[model samples]
Structure formats: structure tokens, C-alpha cells
Target: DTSLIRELAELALAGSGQHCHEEALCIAEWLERLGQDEAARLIRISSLANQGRYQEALAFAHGNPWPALEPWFALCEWHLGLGAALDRRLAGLGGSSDPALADFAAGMRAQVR
Candidate 1:
């Protein structure tokens, strides 16, 4: 992973952990300044989900590439009150066995139900 990503990511998690929504946006503007704009878009989107503003969270998906299911797609899980649709989709993806993926999956599962 890139070092820039780490600095921004700690900021992401730190803000998320603290429920610091604005703190997360600070990172977003930084990304936009640096021209990592797509991820900048993501920070705001996921940040919406973090705040339980789920529909608004998903509202950002319109511009993505068609068939536009990106990994961050799950965070917008509508983070799964999308309900059975999301549950089926989650399982339908192949499990690669990386702990980070699993860790995220576990976190989503805990939250999903």
C-alpha cells in the first residue's frame, strides 16, 4: 500500500472510531487536493454510512463504472438494510481467505444483522 494511503487511512479509521465525521472530510479534502479524487468521493460516501445515513450513503454510486460494484460497494450496504439483497450478494462473492477481507467481512456481518 502507498504511504499516502496509510496517513489518509489512519485518519479514516481514527475519525470513524471517534465518530468524527468532519475529521473524515478533512482527509477527503486532502485527497482531493492531492488528486486522489475518486477516493475523495468515497470518503464522503462511506462517511455517510458511518453516520447511519444509509440511503444518502448510496446516493454517491451513480457515477461509478457500469455494473459498478466496487469493493467499497458493501460499505454503502444501504451497510446492508439493503437486507437480503446484500446478504446474498455478500455470500455470492468468492472468499479469498485474506484476513483483511475476512476482517472486513466479519465487521460487516456483525453490523449486517
Candidate 2:
């Protein structure tokens, strides 16, 4: 059900941030079972980043065109050291007023040059 999926998703995200790829992937699978396909995709992609497989994440995010997934895409681009395109990306990236978005804007700017 939706309830269990949310808990699993939260656990998966926490696991991913802690670099627990195996646990994250297991929770991600349960998310899909509850019909949370998009959430599953997010966790899987996030696990790639947590595992330091940015190139794999980049390939997975490439051409997906999902607005919700843009940050992950940019995360890969920024990690992969794509300067020119990502510089242009930060133009819009820096526009967000949210705290986390602003944090990325600063982080990306610091790393870009």
C-alpha cells in the first residue's frame, strides 16, 4: 500500500545517503511493488550516486526529460565535471530560492571554475 511504500521510500533515501546501496536497492524494490515506480527510479538512480557511479547515473538520467529527475541529472553532470553545459545549467540552478537549491547553486559555483 501507499503507506508502507512511503516508509520504505524514506528508509531507502536514508540508506542511500548513508551509502548503503544494498539496503537501498532492497527498499527500492518494495517501493515498486507498491506501484511507486517513479520513487523506485529515484532510489535506484540515487544508489548509483551513493556508489560513486556517476557515469552510470549520467547514462541513466540522460534524455529522460523528467522535471523531477533534473537535479539528479545535474548532480551527475556536475560530478562528471561537465563545465560549459553545467555552467549554463547553474544559471537556472542559481535561480531557485529554496534553501537546498541555493546550497547547490553555491556548491556548483564553487566547483565549476
Please give the distance, in angstroms, between residue 87's alpha carbon in candidate 2 and its true position after superposition. Answer: 2.2
Could you tell me every candidate's TM-score relative to the true structure? 0.57, 0.73
Decoy 2 TM-score against native: 0.73
Residue 43 miss distance in model 1 (angstroms): 2.7
Q: Candidate 1: which stretches are off by over 4 Å?
A: 1-9, 62-72, 75-80, 95-113
- Model 1, 77-106: lDDT tens digits are 634556675665455332636556556656
Candidate 1, position 99, lDDT: 52
lDDT of 2 by residue, 11-106 (tens): 998888887899999988877877787888888889998788988877866556454665786777777878776777666667766657657766
Pairs with steric clashes in candidate 1: 77-80
Q: CA lDDT of each candidate?
A: 0.64, 0.77
